[PDB]
Design an enzyme around this catalytic site. Sequence first.
Site, PDB file in Angstrom:
ATOM      1  N   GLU A   1      -0.674  -1.576  13.852  1.00 47.32           N
ATOM      2  CA  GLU A   1      -1.428  -0.728  12.971  1.00 47.32           C
ATOM      3  C   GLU A   1      -2.856  -0.626  13.434  1.00 47.32           C
ATOM      4  O   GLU A   1      -3.547  -1.643  13.600  1.00 47.32           O
ATOM      5  CB  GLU A   1      -1.419  -1.261  11.542  1.00 47.32           C
ATOM      6  CG  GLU A   1      -0.212  -0.876  10.752  1.00 47.32           C
ATOM      7  CD  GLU A   1      -0.270  -1.359   9.321  1.00 47.32           C
ATOM      8  OE1 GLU A   1      -1.356  -1.318   8.714  1.00 47.32           O
ATOM      9  OE2 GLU A   1       0.766  -1.787   8.794  1.00 47.32           O
TER      10      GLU A   1
ATOM     11  N   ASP B   1       0.758  -1.257   0.000  1.00 50.39           N
ATOM     12  CA  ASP B   1       0.000   0.000   0.000  1.00 50.39           C
ATOM     13  C   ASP B   1       0.791   1.311   0.000  1.00 50.39           C
ATOM     14  O   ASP B   1       0.263   2.376   0.301  1.00 50.39           O
ATOM     15  CB  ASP B   1      -1.093  -0.057   1.072  1.00 50.39           C
ATOM     16  CG  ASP B   1      -2.020   1.135   1.043  1.00 50.39           C
ATOM     17  OD1 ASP B   1      -2.331   1.651  -0.040  1.00 50.39           O
ATOM     18  OD2 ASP B   1      -2.444   1.551   2.128  1.00 50.39           O
TER      19      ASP B   1
ATOM     20  N   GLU C   1       2.224  -8.780   6.878  1.00 46.00           N
ATOM     21  CA  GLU C   1       0.947  -9.198   6.247  1.00 46.00           C
ATOM     22  C   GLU C   1       1.047 -10.228   5.109  1.00 46.00           C
ATOM     23  O   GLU C   1       0.485 -10.033   4.035  1.00 46.00           O
ATOM     24  CB  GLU C   1       0.143  -7.979   5.800  1.00 46.00           C
ATOM     25  CG  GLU C   1      -0.255  -7.117   6.951  1.00 46.00           C
ATOM     26  CD  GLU C   1      -1.267  -6.046   6.591  1.00 46.00           C
ATOM     27  OE1 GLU C   1      -1.450  -5.740   5.399  1.00 46.00           O
ATOM     28  OE2 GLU C   1      -1.871  -5.488   7.532  1.00 46.00           O
TER      29      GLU C   1
ATOM     30  N   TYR D   1      -8.285  -3.075  11.539  1.00 45.37           N
ATOM     31  CA  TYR D   1      -9.062  -2.039  10.910  1.00 45.37           C
ATOM     32  C   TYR D   1     -10.549  -2.199  11.040  1.00 45.37           C
ATOM     33  O   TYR D   1     -11.266  -1.817  10.180  1.00 45.37           O
ATOM     34  CB  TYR D   1      -8.637  -1.863   9.445  1.00 45.37           C
ATOM     35  CG  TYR D   1      -7.254  -1.357   9.323  1.00 45.37           C
ATOM     36  CD1 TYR D   1      -7.009  -0.042   9.350  1.00 45.37           C
ATOM     37  CD2 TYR D   1      -6.201  -2.206   9.237  1.00 45.37           C
ATOM     38  CE1 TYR D   1      -5.786   0.417   9.289  1.00 45.37           C
ATOM     39  CE2 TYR D   1      -4.996  -1.753   9.189  1.00 45.37           C
ATOM     40  CZ  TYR D   1      -4.780  -0.423   9.209  1.00 45.37           C
ATOM     41  OH  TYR D   1      -3.557   0.092   9.159  1.00 45.37           O
TER      42      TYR D   1
HETATM   43  O1  LIG Z   1      -4.491  -0.081   4.279  1.00 41.69           O
HETATM   44  C1  LIG Z   1      -3.965   0.493   5.199  1.00 41.69           C
HETATM   45  O2  LIG Z   1      -4.353   1.572   5.612  1.00 41.69           O
HETATM   46  C2  LIG Z   1      -2.751  -0.165   5.839  1.00 41.69           C
HETATM   47  N1  LIG Z   1      -3.143  -1.468   6.365  1.00 41.69           N
HETATM   48  C3  LIG Z   1      -2.346  -2.554   6.432  1.00 41.69           C
HETATM   49  O3  LIG Z   1      -2.774  -3.541   6.997  1.00 41.69           O
HETATM   50  C4  LIG Z   1      -0.943  -2.554   5.831  1.00 41.69           C
HETATM   51  O4  LIG Z   1      -0.027  -3.143   6.744  1.00 41.69           O
HETATM   52  C5  LIG Z   1      -0.484  -1.140   5.551  1.00 41.69           C
HETATM   53  O5  LIG Z   1       0.570  -1.248   4.609  1.00 41.69           O
HETATM   54  C6  LIG Z   1      -1.598  -0.338   4.877  1.00 41.69           C
HETATM   55  O6  LIG Z   1      -1.079   0.940   4.539  1.00 41.69           O
END
Ligand SMILES: O=C(O)[C@H]1NC(=O)[C@H](O)[C@@H](O)[C@@H]1O
Lengths: 596, 596
Positions: A499, A165, A408, A463
């Site tokens: 993250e 990403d 990942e 997320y």
């Molecule tokens: O999509 C994202 O916001 C982030 N999520 C992830 O899980 C990745 O580890 C990152 O590279 C990416 O930038």
Amino acid sequence: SHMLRPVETPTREIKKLDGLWAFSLDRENCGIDQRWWESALQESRAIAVPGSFNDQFADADIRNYAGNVWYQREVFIPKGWAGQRIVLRFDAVTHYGKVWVNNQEVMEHQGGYTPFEADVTPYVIAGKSVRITVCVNNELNWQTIPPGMVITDENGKKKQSYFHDFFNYAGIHRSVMLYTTPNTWVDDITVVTHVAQDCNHASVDWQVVANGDVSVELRDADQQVVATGQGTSGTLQVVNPHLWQPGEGYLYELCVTAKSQTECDIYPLRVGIRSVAVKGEQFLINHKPFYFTGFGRHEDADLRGKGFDNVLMVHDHALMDWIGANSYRTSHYPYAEEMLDWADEHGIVVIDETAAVGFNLSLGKPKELYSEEAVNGETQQAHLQAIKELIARDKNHPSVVMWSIANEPDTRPQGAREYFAPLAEATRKLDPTRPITCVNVMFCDAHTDTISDLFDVLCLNRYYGWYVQSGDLETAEKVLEKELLAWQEKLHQPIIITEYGVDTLAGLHSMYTDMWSEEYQCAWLDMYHRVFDRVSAVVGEQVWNFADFATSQGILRVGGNKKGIFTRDRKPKSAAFLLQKRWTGMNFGEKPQQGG
Amino acid sequence: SHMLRPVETPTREIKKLDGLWAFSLDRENCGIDQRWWESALQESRAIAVPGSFNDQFADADIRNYAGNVWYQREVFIPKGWAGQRIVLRFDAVTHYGKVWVNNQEVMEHQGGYTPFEADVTPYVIAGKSVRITVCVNNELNWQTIPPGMVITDENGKKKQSYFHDFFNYAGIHRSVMLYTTPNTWVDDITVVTHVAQDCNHASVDWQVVANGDVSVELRDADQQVVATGQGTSGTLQVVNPHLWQPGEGYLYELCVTAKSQTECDIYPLRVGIRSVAVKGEQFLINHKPFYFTGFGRHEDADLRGKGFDNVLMVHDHALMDWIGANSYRTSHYPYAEEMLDWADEHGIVVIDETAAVGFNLSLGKPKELYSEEAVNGETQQAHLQAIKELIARDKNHPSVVMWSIANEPDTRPQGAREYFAPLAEATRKLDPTRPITCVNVMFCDAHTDTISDLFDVLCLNRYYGWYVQSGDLETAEKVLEKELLAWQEKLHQPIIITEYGVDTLAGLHSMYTDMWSEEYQCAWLDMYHRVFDRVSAVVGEQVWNFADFATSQGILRVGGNKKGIFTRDRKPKSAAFLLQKRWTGMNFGEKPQQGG
Ligand SMILES: O=C(O)[C@H]1NC(=O)[C@H](O)[C@@H](O)[C@@H]1O
Ligand SMILES: O=C(O)[C@H]1NC(=O)[C@H](O)[C@@H](O)[C@@H]1O
């Protein structure tokens, strides 16, 4: 090979990170056939180095270029260089570099983020000017680290597609230099530091001195010899130590001496006396439970794609300091060593990570990720090599408390384990002194992941409430808590959320506290924090992302990734103040008591 | 002092501009009193050099600091530099520097935009580390260039006040280099070009050999000797011309060879064969009518303030080239010489300018601008002194077509003409080869302005429609035309509009095409264009500004100054495409038909 970091004393550097080099694209791939390294680059424009090449010229076609580019430069060997060992070094050259000193190929490297160097003594005359041509390649494939697939269309024009990403910036991103040593020279040091309930310890040394006997002395911050050692190879020092500690990072200095019958070499290595250990669900530094705060970062800024810069570094560290961040992870590639020197000096805790991202085909052509076509025995060797070069580089930095092998990978298929088990073992052989991790993608959750038991610390990228349960903090919160507890009971390891973050358009404000608004970013981080504080296994929180950064174009990225706490020009979004309050309000390095 | 651009032949330099110096504020003004230069600065922190100190730390209290700051750094002297001449050079230290080498005061300077150098051979031992300490002062007063007043508050602390629009960024803005030369060497040169009708013509050298004879050969771009002189003090060289032209800017090379019994010093200079003079209403480039396009610019960027940066330089030139700029002015201070080599090499035209802005009290406490209280003889000297140092530095740069002695003085008060006539005199003598100007403010208009007659080219900063006739294109157009025509009468001097611009918020869009909207910028720039064309006397357009840039805080400046065609992060406003189309739809160096 072996990598020591160029310092001056007996040994000296010419920068040649003087920036202006000749530059041209090699659209036809004529460059090697015609031996462009044999004369001045033709049709060449000025370029800055250290720096990505992509953004320097505000031209879409240079930016989106795939294939070979050429850097050329003439330089002067210092007259005084005489009969010393002269070495030409590149701190990084993105993806691939091949180097010529005047129609003499001196080195080759695959790896976008770690140094390569060659002894050039025999190929250069002191007091004379030499032409240096680097052919740089930005292409990725299944054996490159990170992986990719170049697509050539019907016209034979290449286009790079990749699975991570961030944007595939390329070029000479870091210092290139010329440097000196005596013909007796220290070229590898390995220091391990032990501590025993923080009143005393031993610091073992292991030393490789190309044709020299070695002696060792350890000096204070106020420069007084506190221990000595001969045993020019294996020498253990006992001390009443000032421990290198997260808050302050007290640094001792180890002087390594290579004596020939006629020749001397002197190498100073900064040393922080600290132990890193996982005990159950804790991450201990100098035998105390630590709690990480701070960011996943990138190497990204306007006009420099990933190019190193000192102002940017000074500035970002003032931000991280102001906000109360005690740590970060070199997200997705090894960072400039200057960063680790900073961290060592300032007592910043670092999770050091290889470039092994994009092992995943489900992030959002080959049908098996672990495949001869796609992730294979060659890839695994390239992966191990990446691990080797990173550890060879960063092994003596007390700021590095953990190695991250990959970010990942898709761990669902059988074979993920086949592929990763040997890397996990190898890594531990390479460095016995540090916990090891493999950063974990959301969809390989507690019940489906096949790999995490093979590492020491659980680092989750989560997320919920964004890519899934979108906008819904209430059910986001339930899924997050249930997931983290599942992991705790499954593995009984320390958990770091390496993250968590949401895209936020600076200036987008909403009463409804919905997606892409400063207020949603605030409420979402806040909910995540609430959960972390309720889970004992959670030992750390690294927000995604320090700042907005470039990515490939698509529908999911509005001019790029907007999960920064700061914008790309380092302006704070309101979430920056939220984090400031949580992080400066905690007891340093200590986990909240799950109440204000 | 004598001033030469250090370059690498038999001569060597080590940049100490390797960035990380130790930094401290002296809030208590103890620094000089306690010889801070004698020991490691305490309460110190890392700072990057080259760069402004103000914005590196995201701290308001440091940003608004007035007084002394301390820069310290240790540097190992190279072993092959031992009985050679060693010179310590700072290309710029903003406002004032005081330098020590291990308790040895070596140099002092007033003027933040020009180099200062001293031989340090006696105070430094080769192969040893010496400590470098610098005292940097940012305070401005009436004797200073540009002027200011500093107020000490009721609480006791200092606050700076100044009268120029841009922000008072201070610190070590440009590189610092250690510098090598033989015991007999060159420290001065001067060159002039004559070209009569582009037939073969001559270049007169004049040189200073510090105890040597010189051979002085001119080489073509192919290092093919096309002329030679031995008269180390005065010569002439003549061959079929090969003009330095604004399109491509071809250069020759002049090896300056300086001979002693034991040592030879070869110094290289670059030469652009070209002619610049006015005939009536016309600025002629090599005896041919030139029409300026491009910008007023600043040295300003996001985290470095006015600190030099190669990537920024490469990028900005890409943008100017793309947009059709052929010219710019070093706005309100002299720029980094790197910029002038670029212009020399790429054939860009540069109106060079001193730091003498803010002479005026009406731009937006003393009664008489030219008076013992405000601007006096002492001030006229520094002005002189600043003009000396500029020409001393840039006299040899072919890209410089014209000197700008100052920006926007108020010429209405009594004595304005008395003040500028003698400085005009002194400058014409200092460089007879280039025309000379003083940039004029709106309120000193044709009928009111004294002191326009002492200059060869009329450089006008005009804002009708934006500060006056606010938002009214129709009346602003008339005022502008009548103004410009009223200017052809009073004088029949070449007219260049050095500034024409409107604050515009990137992203502010309006159907009403009103002030601070992208549309308005377009409409207004368009309007100046229609008028500009009709006036035969108008030799040029330089848009204010190239990019948004910082200013001191106030109700008239929102981000800072917003008149940039690009934002500070170099993103184009719709007006970038308006200029693009005009400036590339033209014939090069030429004027439009006062119609399509
Ligand atoms: O999509 C994202 O916001 C982030 N999520 C992830 O899980 C990745 O580890 C990152 O590279 C990416 O930038
Ligand atoms: O106020 C402005 O828009 C500009 N006009 C001027 O006449 C001054 O020369 C510049 O410094 C100033 O930034």
